Amino acid sequence: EVQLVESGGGLVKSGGSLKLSCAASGFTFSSYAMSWVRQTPEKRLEWVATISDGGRYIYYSDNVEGRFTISRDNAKNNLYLQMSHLKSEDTAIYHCARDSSGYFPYFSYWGQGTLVT
Amino acid sequence: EVQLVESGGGLVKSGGSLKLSCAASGFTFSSYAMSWVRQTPEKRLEWVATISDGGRYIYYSDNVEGRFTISRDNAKNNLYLQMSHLKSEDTAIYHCARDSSGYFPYFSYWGQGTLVT
Amino acid sequence: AKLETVTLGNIGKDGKQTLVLNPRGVNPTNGVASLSQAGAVPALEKRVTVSVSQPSRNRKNYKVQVKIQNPTACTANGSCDPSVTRQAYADVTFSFTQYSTDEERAFVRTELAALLASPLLIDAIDQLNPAY
Amino acid sequence: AKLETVTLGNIGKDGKQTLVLNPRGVNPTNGVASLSQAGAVPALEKRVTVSVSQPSRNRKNYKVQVKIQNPTACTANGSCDPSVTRQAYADVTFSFTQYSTDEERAFVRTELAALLASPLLIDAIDQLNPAY
Amino acid sequence: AKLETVTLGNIGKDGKQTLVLNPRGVNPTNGVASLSQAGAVPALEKRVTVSVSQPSRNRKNYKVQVKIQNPTACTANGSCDPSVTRQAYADVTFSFTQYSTDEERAFVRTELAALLASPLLIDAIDQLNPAY
Amino acid sequence: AKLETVTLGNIGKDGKQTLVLNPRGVNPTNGVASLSQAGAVPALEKRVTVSVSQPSRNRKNYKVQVKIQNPTACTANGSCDPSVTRQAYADVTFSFTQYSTDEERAFVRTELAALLASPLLIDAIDQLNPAY
Amino acid sequence: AKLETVTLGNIGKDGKQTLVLNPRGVNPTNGVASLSQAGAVPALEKRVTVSVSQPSRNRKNYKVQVKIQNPTACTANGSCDPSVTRQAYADVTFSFTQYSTDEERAFVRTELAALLASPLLIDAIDQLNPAY
Amino acid sequence: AKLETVTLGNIGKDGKQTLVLNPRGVNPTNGVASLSQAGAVPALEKRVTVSVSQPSRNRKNYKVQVKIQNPTACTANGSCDPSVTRQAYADVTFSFTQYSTDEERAFVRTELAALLASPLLIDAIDQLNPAY
C-alpha cells in the first residue's frame, strides 16, 4: 500500500530553519513526482512545491519561492523540504502528497503531516 | 561561397561616363540573372536594371532608361554598367545583386558596392 | 507501475493540446497493458499499448515495446455515422541486456524524448523531408 | 532538413547531462542519415540514424524510422584500447498515409515525446517492471 | 545548380497565374532532385523532379530528365476530405553525347521552350487536335 | 489475487531487514507468476515465483508451488560486470485433493510457517545441524 | 559534407591559377562522389572523385580514396572534334583503423599536404628526378 | 634530388607541429628512397618513402609513388617494450606519359596539395564524413 510517513515539526520561532521528510514506501518512489501541500489552522488547503521524477523540474508557489527549497533522494526514498526565514504565517500541517500521472498533479495519495509553528 | 566584388567608382563631374564591373565567383554565372541596386546617401534603396540569363531580356527603371546600359560577359564572369550624362542625383553605392530563381527577382545575394558621385 | 490515467499535456504542432488516456486493463495472454481514450465507439479511440518481455530461452534480452494508434474519422455522402479512414501508427522497441545498469536504460529513454523535439526530427515527421 | 550538429540538453535520469552529435553524412545505398558522438574513436561511440521512405509499388504509405544505439566501454587490464561489452537499442518507426495532414503527424510525435516522461514508461523502461 | 524556390510566372491559358515550388531535397539512391508546392497533405501537391545521369559503361550518353505531376482534387457525396481524381503528367528526356558543345545543348533547351508557345502546339495540347 | 508490490518486513537472521518485491507478469504458457526485487543489474535480483494449478471441473489434484532464488555478486578483477558466485534456492510445493476444505489447507500453511520459526529448523538450516 | 562548388586557388606551377569544380552527384552503387570542372566538350574535363567507406558498427578499416585525372586536347587535322592525347593521373588512398583518433588522421593529411610543397617532391614529380 | 633532412613545419591538426625526417638510403633493388624520423626504439618511427621510375629511352609511363605510415605506441603491462597498436597509412601514386610537360605535372601536384587543405577533404578524412 502507498504510505507516506512524515517527520520534523515542532515549535520554532520566526527567522529559523527546518527540514522535513517523507518515508514513501509501497511503490517505486523514483518514478513519480512529489509535492508538499499545507493546511492552515484556519482550515484551508494551499500548495507549496512540486518536484519532478529525477528532481529536474521544480515548481514553487509565490509565498514559498524566495525562501524554501525542495529536494529528494531516490536511493533512500526520502522527500525533503528545507525551510528558512519563517515569516509567521506558515503554521500548517504540511502533508506529503504523491503526484498523479500527468502534466500538473491532482494529488492521488496523501499523508498525516507534521505540525509546525 | 557566392561573392560579388565590384570595381569602378570615384569622383566624376556631371555629364561624364563610367563603367562598373562585378567579379561574380562561387557559382555558375551564366545561369542566373543579374541586377544593379543603388543606395542613395539619404539611406534609401532603389533599383537600376536587370539583365537575364543570356543577356536577352533587359529591364530598366524610369530614371535610368534614357542614359544607362547594362551588359554581361558569360566567359569572363563580369557584369557591367555603362553610365552617361550623370545628372547630379546618382551618387549611390551601386550594389551588385544575384537574382533569385524566378520571374521577377528578390535579390538573394549582394555585394559591397562602389561609391560614385 | 500501476495503470492509472496518463494525462499528457503540451501536445501538438503549436503545443496547447492535451490528451487523457483511461486504462483498459492488462491482457494476460501476452502481458500487454492498454490505455485508451474516452470514446463510446471502440473504433474511434486513440489507444496506447506497452509491454516489457522477460528474456526467455530464445531471445536473451529484455524488450520494452510501446505502440500508439491514432485514427481519424469522417462521414461520407449518404452515410450517417462516422467511419474510420486513416491510421497513424507508432512503434518503439527498446532492447537491453542482463548486465545493463538503470542509468544506461534511463539515458536511452531521455535521449529519445529529446530527439523528438529537435529541428532535425520535427522536419522529417511533420513535413516528411529526409535529412539532406 | 539539414544535417547540422545536435545538442541534446537535459538528458539522463537526473537531467543535467548533454549529448552532442555531429553529422556523419547520408548513405547512398539506403538514404539513411547518420550522427555520432562529438569526440570518440569510431566503433566506440553513440550512434543515431534516421531515414524517411516514400510510397512505392510495395507500400502505399510513408515511413519515418529513427534508430539509436549506444555501447559501453570496458577498459580491460593488459590492453590499451577498450572493448564493447553490450549495446542498448531503441528503434522508433512511424507510419503515415499519403492523405495525413501536418497536425496529425505532429500529434503523434509530441504524444510520444510526452509519454516517455510518464510514470507508466519511466518504470517500464529504466526499472523493467511491467504495468499492472 | 542549387535547390532554391523556382517561382514561375505567366502560366495558364490566359497567362496571369503563378506557381511557387519549394525544394524537397535530393534523393541519394538515384540522384533525383525534387521541387514541390506548399500543401500540407502530400497527395495534393504539384511536384517537379529533375535528374541528369552520367554516362555509365552501358548507356554512353548524358541524359537530362524532367518530370511534372499535377493532381486535381474534389470531394464526393458522403465524404469529408478531398481525394485525388486525376493526374496530368509530363515527361521530358534530353540526350547528348560526350563531344557536344554547350551551344548545341542550349539550342535544344530554347527550341523546346519556343515550340510550346507556338500555335501548332497550343492546339494539340489545349484542344487535343492532331496536326492536320 | 492480482499481483501487487509485496513488502516483507522483519525478515533476515536478526529480523530487521526488508525485501520489496515488484510484480513481473504471468508466464502465459505455464501460468507461473513472477515477483522480483528492484535491484540494478537484473542478472542479480531476489526472485520469487508462484504457481497454482487452474480450477477445472475434472481436476483431481491441486498443486501450489513457490520458488525462491537469491544470487550473490562478485566483482571479479579484470571485468566491469559483477558475476554470480552461487545461488540460494528454496522450493515449496503443496498438494491437495478436490474434496479438501479451506481449514485443512490453511492448517498446512500455518504449520510450515511456524516450523520455520521453531528452533528445530532455525538450527537445521542456519547452522546445518541434522536432527538426531 | 554536402557537395558544394570548390574553388582551388593559387594552384599550378607558378601558383597563380584556379580550378573551379562543380559537383556531379553520388554514384549509388559504390558511393563515389564526383566533382568536375565546367569546361565544354565533357569528354575533356578536369575530374576529381572522392570515396569514403561508410560508418558501420562492425567495420575494421576505414579507407579514403581520392582520384584526379586531367586530359589534354588535340585538334587533329581532318576531324571536327578534339581528342585526348594523354591523361595525368593521381591516386591518393588513406587507411585507418576503428580505434584511430582525429589528430592521428589529421596529422597524416597535413603531412602529405606539406610533402607536396617540399622541395623533395616538387623535384621528384615536376622534373622526374629520383631521390638518391 | 639528393636526399637531405626535411623539416615539415606547421603540420598537424591545429597546424603547430613539426616533423623532422632524416634520410635512410636508397634500396638498391627497386630504387625506393626512404626517410625516417629521429625517434628512439626504431620499431616505432614516422616513415616516408618515395619511388620514381628511372629515365629510360623506351619508357612509356613515368610513375611516382609516395608512402607514409605512422605507428602508435602502447606500453602494455607485463612487457618492457612498447608495441604497435595500429598504423596510419597514406599511398600517393602519380602516373604520367612520356610526352607530358612540366606544367601538366606541376598542376596535378599543386591540385592534390590544395584539395587536402580544402574543407571537402579536411572533413572526409579527419571526421570520416562521406561526401553526398
Side-chain angles (χ1 to χ4, degrees), chain C residues 62-121:
Chain C
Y62 288 85
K63 185 176 76 175
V64 183
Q65 183 166 2
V66 175
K67 291 184 183 181
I68 289 170
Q69 182 177 0
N70 300 117
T72 62
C74 66
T75 180
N77 292 319
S79 179
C80 291
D81 288 332
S83 67
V84 181
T85 54
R86 294 192 297 268
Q87 295 289 329
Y89 300 108
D91 178 72
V92 187
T93 69
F94 291 91
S95 179
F96 309 104
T97 64
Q98 291 181 355
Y99 291 96
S100 65
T101 66
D102 54 353
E103 292 180 353
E104 299 177 358
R105 290 190 296 262
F107 193 79
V108 180
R109 176 184 60 82
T110 59
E111 183 179 0
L112 187 62
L115 284 175
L116 294 171
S118 70
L120 193 276
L121 269 303

Side-chain angles (χ1 to χ4, degrees), chain F residues 47-49 65-70 87-93 116 125:
Chain F
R47 290 180 181 175
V48 180
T49 67
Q65 189 168 2
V66 178
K67 295 188 181 182
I68 298 169
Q69 60 184 359
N70 310 128
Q87 297 285 110
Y89 296 105
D91 194 1
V92 177
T93 171
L116 292 171
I125 299 171

Side-chain angles (χ1 to χ4, degrees), chain H residues 54-105:
Chain H
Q54 293 301 116
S56 178
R57 183 179 64 191
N58 53 4
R59 184 177 295 277
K60 299 294 182 183
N61 295 111
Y62 291 90
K63 186 172 74 70
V64 178
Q65 189 168 2
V66 178
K67 295 188 181 182
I68 298 169
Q69 60 184 359
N70 310 128
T72 58
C74 181
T75 61
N77 297 116
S79 180
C80 297
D81 292 330
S83 64
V84 173
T85 299
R86 64 185 181 272
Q87 297 285 110
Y89 296 105
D91 194 1
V92 177
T93 171
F94 292 97
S95 177
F96 303 107
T97 60
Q98 65 177 356
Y99 287 98
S100 64
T101 62
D102 198 6
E103 296 178 353
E104 299 178 357
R105 294 192 298 266

